[PDB]
């Protein structure tokens, strides 16, 4: 990245916004993050598609619970050789805590981890 041109997907301001929003729990800050991301001019195919419907809006309470959606995301594998063991363990702990499925990767796994703490 340079200030001349060649727009990228991750710049400084967006990174800082995401980090502050995730460390401060301010969901309004995350909404500002999402508005900052979606506001950039087209860069991918998925920025050339609009979505519409025909029925009436439905209040947000009727939408299924948050946990039934969080249990759908997964964390793709990342080899223990690439990133330090601390990050691997933190990702595993968090994902197995919310209930989703984390991934190990190619670098295998330490046997002493095969039991809960």
């Amino acid at each position: 990245f340079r200030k001349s041109g060649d727009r990228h997907g991750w710049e400084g301001g967006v990174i800082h916004t995401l980090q502050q929003a995730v460390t401060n729990d301010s969901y309004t800050t995350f909404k500002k993050y999402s508005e900052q991301v979606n506001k950039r001019p087209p860069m991918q195919l998925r920025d050339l598609l609009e979505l519409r419907s025909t029925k009436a809006p439905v209040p947000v309470d009727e939408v299924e619970s948050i946990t039934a959606i969080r249990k759908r995301f997964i964390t793709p594998g990342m080899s223990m050789g690439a990133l330090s063991p601390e990050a691997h363990g933190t990702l595993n702990v968090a994902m197995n805590r919310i209930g989703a499925k984390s991934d190990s990767g190619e670098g295998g796994e330490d046997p002493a981890r095969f039991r809960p703490d």
């Binding site: 946990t67 805590r97 809960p116």
Partner: protein, 116 residues
């Protein structure tokens, strides 16, 4: 001594057996809810106005449901949000690990978080 209480209840049941045999029945289910077996005797020497115990013997016909009948087990009760938790938190009850859950709560839902 507990033997005293055991003997006391044995004696009570024995007397009940004897009087029920003398009455002309065979079990307790045959007598619960019947008031047409009682009668009133008064004290004529006291001359007081006879206590009108008649309303205490008023017998209303039960229809099809027996006077003593009762269903088995406790009466059911609708389920709250707690059920939705005990299905999504089963890893806790099988391994014992930390858990963080999130939900929307309406006012109709009652006693959120007692079954767990």
């Amino acid at each position: 001594t507990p033997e005293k209480v055991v003997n006391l209840f044995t004696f009570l049941a024995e007397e009940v057996r004897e009087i029920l045999a003398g009455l002309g029945f065979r079990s307790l289910n045959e007598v619960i809810g019947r008031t047409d077996l009682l009668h009133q005797v008064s004290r004529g020497a006291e001359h007081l106005d006879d206590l009108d115990l008649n309303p205490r013997l008023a017998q209303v016909d039960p229809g099809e449901n027996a006077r003593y009948c009762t269903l088995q087990g406790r009466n059911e009760v609708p389920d709250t949000l707690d059920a939705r938790i005990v299905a999504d938190a089963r890893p806790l009850f099988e391994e014992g690990e930390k858990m963080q859950l999130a939900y929307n709560a309406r006012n109709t839902q009652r006693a959120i978080g007692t079954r767990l």
